[PDB]
Swiss-Prot record, chain A:
Note from the entry: Present with 1660 molecules/cell in log phase SD medium.
A cellular component annotation (GO) from this entry: cytosol
Descriptive protein name: Trafficking protein particle complex II-specific subunit 65
Organism of provenance: Saccharomyces cerevisiae (strain ATCC 204508 / S288c)
Gene Ontology process terms (BP): beta-glucan biosynthetic process; cell wall organization; intra-Golgi vesicle-mediated transport; protein-containing complex assembly; retrograde transport, endosome to Golgi
Function: Specific subunit of the TRAPP II complex, a highly conserved vesicle tethering complex that functions in the late Golgi as a guanine nucleotide exchanger (GEF) for the Golgi YPT1 GTPase. TRS65 plays a role in the YPT GEF activity of TRAPP II in concert with the two other TRAPP II-specific subunits TRS120 and TRS130. Involved in cell wall (1-->6)-beta-glucan synthesis.
Quaternary structure and interacting proteins, as annotated: Part of the multisubunit TRAPP (transport protein particle) II complex composed of BET3, BET5, TRS20, TRS23, TRS31, TRS33, TRS65, TRS120 and TRS130. Interacts directly with TRS120 and TRS130.
The UniProt record lists the keyword RNA-binding: no
UniProtKB/Swiss-Prot annotation, chain B:
Further details from the record: Present with 259 molecules/cell in log phase SD medium.
Annotated function: Specific subunit of the TRAPP II complex, a highly conserved vesicle tethering complex that functions in the late Golgi as a guanine nucleotide exchanger (GEF) for the Golgi YPT1 GTPase. TRS120 plays a role in the YPT GEF activity of TRAPP II in concert with the two other TRAPP II-specific subunits TRS65 and TRS130.
Annotated source species: Saccharomyces cerevisiae (strain ATCC 204508 / S288c) (Baker's yeast)
Signal peptide annotation: none
Family note: Belongs to the TRS120 family.
Localization terms from the record: Golgi apparatus, cis-Golgi network
Record note on quaternary structure: Part of the multisubunit TRAPP (transport protein particle) II complex composed of BET3, BET5, TRS20, TRS23, TRS31, TRS33, TRS65, TRS120 and TRS130. Interacts directly with TRS65.
Protein name: Trafficking protein particle complex II-specific subunit 120
Curated annotation (Swiss-Prot), chain C:
Name of the protein this chain belongs to: Trafficking protein particle complex II-specific subunit 130
Tagged with keyword Lipid biosynthesis: no
Purpose of the protein: Specific subunit of the TRAPP II complex, a highly conserved vesicle tethering complex that functions in the late Golgi as a guanine nucleotide exchange factor (GEF) for the Golgi YPT1 GTPase. TRS130 plays a role in the YPT GEF activity of TRAPP II in concert with the two other TRAPP II-specific subunits TRS65 and TRS120. Required for both the cytoplasm-to-vacuole targeting (Cvt) pathway and starvation-induced autophagy through its role in ATG8 and ATG9 trafficking.
Coiled-coil zones: none
Family: Belongs to the TMEM1 family.
Subunit structure: Part of the multisubunit TRAPP (transport protein particle) II complex composed of BET3, BET5, TRS20, TRS23, TRS31, TRS33, TRS65, TRS120 and TRS130. Interacts with YPT31 and YPT32.
Gene Ontology CC terms, in alphabetical order: cytosol; early endosome; trans-Golgi network; TRAPPII protein complex
Organism listed in the record: Saccharomyces cerevisiae (strain ATCC 204508 / S288c)
Additional notes on this entry: Present with 432 molecules/cell in log phase SD medium.
Subcellular location: Golgi apparatus
GO biological process terms held by the UniProt record: cytoplasm to vacuole targeting by the Cvt pathway; early endosome to Golgi transport; intra-Golgi vesicle-mediated transport; macroautophagy; retrograde transport, endosome to Golgi
Keywords: Autophagy, Golgi apparatus, Transport
């Protein structure tokens, strides 16, 4: 074995988990082979890695990678092509057969037949927030990453619960500073002074009765990921329910 | 920016940031108030401050509509807000002891006088929809219930301990311009409070425009000649200064923070001027 | 002040610190003092010269004692004319055992003495030939400085060119690396998400060994992370470099190395032996 490699599959909750095996012909056989080649007056080898594709299942299909693969042949390089893989709905882990081939055109144009094709198990190795009191769940129908200027915009929230008491929630945005190491002492304040100053909710204390279009305008600009001021609350048995979801860039 | 002049309260502060450029921004505040009707008819609701003209609103039978009225601040060196407090409608009476602390009397005077200041120029006007004849007004004397400590900070700047302003000349700086920053400090009408500390300490903190909390050793960033503590004089103006040699990024904000000692949590004013410069 | 070398080899400086009005510091090192200097380049770009600096420091126990020997005891043309006129060596023996407590010299006070004693000092003053008026002024000054405070007044009025300035010097000499090169990469944001709106860091690094590596890292973003796995073609120039990944990921790990320092040596054509790579979103 010469080309040392690793299998990296990264898991995302946008129903995607990409795969990019990294390869690098490391020093272990290089320290011997590039001194035999140094005795034979060569220090720029070229193993023509040009043929490589993946396999998904028993239907061994070449999945279309997100990146390209031309004739890659140089000395001491290292490559990691990224391939889009569909994320499963559960722990159905598709074992995979990583196939590759490099035709080792050595010094004095000496080709050598070699390939790197083997199989393993391609495990990854690892919107909505639920309630605390009721069966209520909160999601935003409009997409949680959205573009706007400093002007007005429409924002829309899902309320789905059990219809045993299907009512009496209230919103309020609570535009005041949470009053709160010295650089962290002026970091938590500058977090809170742009939470409570950025957007303003133009219909607060909105009685809900499912669907409601909540009404904001933002003043100053930035990335308001998990815009966390707004609080709905159940008027019986008052618990501070929070919706820490959604985002808004203002450029 | 331009073409945002489609929203009724923008163009007031645009039209006085174009002309009368001494009257700057980041000092205009918005007062936010929600109407709610206990009636079956629609109401048309044109609000006037001393020159602000809201457009033709509509409130149907329960639907609140938060009017966003822009005003300016008040200047603590222009009005005295420590004058005879809570003046009686008719003179005389028993003349009994107040029975309250002098400090409490100060905050009661401020929380009354700012309230009547925002009463005295705010006039709504309205008309019904289904009749279009029975116009009317309201008055807000029974409406505005009191102020609390957020409100008396936001209208009245003199409640704060210090008042600073801070300017950076020519905000297009390429790479290699060591440029002084100018800070003008003036203690407020609460210069009478403490007076046993005669020095207070002014941390100048550095924020990125997008991200936050640049560490103070600050390589590939602003380098500073001096240090960022610079103790300031109570009861007198003091022009601190620091020179900024920038290395490479896009844009930054400067702000200050006053801390009354150099121990932890003795900190008193999280002040927020935040000038931005643009670096190529 | 930073010193250009004795060759006078046209190394330009731009910044320099002359604290004329702010003759004021305190250096317990929990707070940080940083001085920075912007050296420029000459017609020739070399490595080694000599650099020195004129740190004109003092001591706080000189400054407040020169305040105490000129305002709190001897601020007259009578006492310093006849009472403490020729007995100043006794005052300069009395001063160096005072131990003024400097923990509140910059917290709402200055010149507040610590818990020494004064009866033995009064007995030593009585055992010499000190007069009654001079002992009256000295006992009044020590009685006032038994517990006292001060503002920031006479921060330079009580040492306005009446003090020594122990001008130190050192030697810094512009350390340099081994291998000099220049790369230029080519980014292409083939992002799995839409865009994370990353913020840039156009790096310019150095490496000082032989058969070595000069690694690098990509930009740092703050949106929904572990994504925007970019595409990159290397396009390194004027060298024989190495590689780490083509179409790598801008995730929690980046690891975009370039082990180019195992070959392709060159000259010291810059101020040091560096490499300034610069990607571009295409």
């Amino acid at each position: 074995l010469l080309n040392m490699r690793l299998r990296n599959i990264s898991l995302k909750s946008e129903h995607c988990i990409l795969s990019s095996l990294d390869f690098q012909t490391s020093k272990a056989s290089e320290q011997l082979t590039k001194k035999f080649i140094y005795p034979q007056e060569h220090n720029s080898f070229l193993k023509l890695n040009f043929q490589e594709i993946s396999y998904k299942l028993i239907d061994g299909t070449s999945q279309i990678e997100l990146d390209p693969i031309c004739p890659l042949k140089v000395p001491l390089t290292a490559f990691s092509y990224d391939s889009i893989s569909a994320t499963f709905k559960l722990v159905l882990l598709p074992k995979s057969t990583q196939p590759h081939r490099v035709k080792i055109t050595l010094a004095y144009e000496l080709e050598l037949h070699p390939n790197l094709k083997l199989p393993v198990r391609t495990s990854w190795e690892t919107s909505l927030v639920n309630s605390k009191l009721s069966n209520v769940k909160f999601k935003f129908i409009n997409s949680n990453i959205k573009v706007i200027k400093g002007e007005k915009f429409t924002m829309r929230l899902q309320i789905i619960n059990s219809s045993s008491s299907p009512l009496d929630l209230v919103v309020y945005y609570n535009n005041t500073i949470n009053p709160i190491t010295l650089e962290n002492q002026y970091q938590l304040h500058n977090k809170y002074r742009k939470i409570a100053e950025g957007i303003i909710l133009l219909s607060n204390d909105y009685k809900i009765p499912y669907f409601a279009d909540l009404r904001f305008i933002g003043i100053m600009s930035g990335y308001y990921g998990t815009l966390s001021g707004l609080k709905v609350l159940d008027l019986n048995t008052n618990e501070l329910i929070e919706v820490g979801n959604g985002a808004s860039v203002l450029i | 920016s331009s073409q945002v002049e489609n929203v009724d309260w923008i163009e007031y502060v645009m039209s006085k940031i174009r002309a009368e450029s001494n009257l700057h921004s980041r000092d205009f505040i918005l007062l936010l108030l929600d109407f709610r009707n206990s009636w079956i008819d629609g109401i048309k609701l044109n609000v006037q401050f001393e020159d602000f003209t809201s457009n033709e609103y509509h409130v149907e039978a329960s639907h609140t509509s938060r009017i966003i009225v822009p005003i300016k601040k008040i200047d603590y060196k222009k009005y005295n807000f420590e004058n005879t407090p809570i003046p009686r409608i008719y003179p005389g009476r028993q003349f009994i002891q107040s029975g309250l602390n002098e400090e409490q009397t100060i905050e009661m005077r401020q929380k009354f006088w700012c309230r009547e200041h925002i009463i005295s120029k705010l006039k709504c006007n309205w008309k019904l929809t289904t009749d279009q004849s029975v116009t009317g007004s309201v008055d807000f004397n029974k409406f505005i219930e009191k102020f609390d400590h957020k409100m008396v900070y936001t209208i009245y700047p003199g409640r704060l301990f210090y008042g600073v302003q801070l300017l950076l000349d020519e905000p297009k700086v390429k790479v290699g311009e060591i440029i002084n920053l100018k800070i003008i400090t003036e203690p407020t009408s609460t210069c009478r409070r403490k007076q046993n500390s005669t020095v207070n300490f002014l941390d100048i903190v550095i924020f990125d425009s997008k991200t936050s909390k640049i560490l103070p050793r600050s390589n590939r960033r602003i380098l500073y000649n001096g240090s960022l503590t610079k103790p300031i004089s109570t009861t007198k103006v003091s022009e601190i200064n620091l020179e900024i040699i920038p290395i490479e990024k896009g844009r930054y904000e400067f702000s200050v923070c006053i801390s009354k000692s150099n121990n932890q949590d003795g900190i008193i004013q999280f002040d927020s001027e935040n000038v931005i410069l643009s670096v190529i | 002040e930073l010193s250009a070398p004795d060759t006078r080899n046209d190394y330009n400086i731009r910044g320099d610190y002359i604290a004329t009005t702010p003759a004021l510091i305190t250096f317990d090192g929990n707070e940080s003092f940083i001085n920075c200097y912007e050296i420029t380049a000459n017609n020739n770009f070399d490595s080694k010269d000599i650099f020195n600096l004129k740190v004109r420091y003092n001591t706080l126990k000189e400054q407040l004692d020169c305040f105490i020997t000129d305002a709190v005891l001897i601020e007259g043309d009578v006492e310093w004319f006849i009472l403490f006129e020729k007995w100043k060596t006794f005052w300069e023996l009395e001063i160096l055992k005072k131990l003024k407590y400097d923990y509140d010299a910059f917290k709402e006070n200055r010149i507040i003495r610590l818990l020494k004693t004064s009866i033995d000092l009064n007995k030593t003053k009585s055992k010499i030939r000190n007069l009654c008026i001079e002992k009256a002024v000295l006992d009044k000054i020590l009685i006032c400085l038994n517990k006292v405070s001060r503002g920031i007044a006479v921060c330079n009025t009580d040492m306005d060119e009446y003090v020594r300035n122990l001008v130190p010097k050192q030697l810094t000499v512009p350390v340099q690396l081994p291998g000099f090169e220049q790369f230029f990469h080519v980014q292409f944001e083939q992002m799995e998400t839409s865009h994370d709106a990353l913020h840039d860091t156009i790096a310019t690094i150095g490496n000082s060994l032989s058969y070595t590596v000069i690694v690098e890292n990509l930009s740092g973003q703050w949106g929904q992370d572990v994504i925007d796995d970019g595409g990159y073609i290397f396009e390194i120039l004027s060298s024989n470099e190495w590689l780490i990944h083509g179409q790598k990921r801008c995730a929690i790990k980046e690891k975009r190395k370039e082990f180019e320092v195992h070959l392709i040596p060159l000259k010291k054509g810059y101020l040091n032996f560096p490499r300034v790579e610069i990607t571009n979103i295409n």
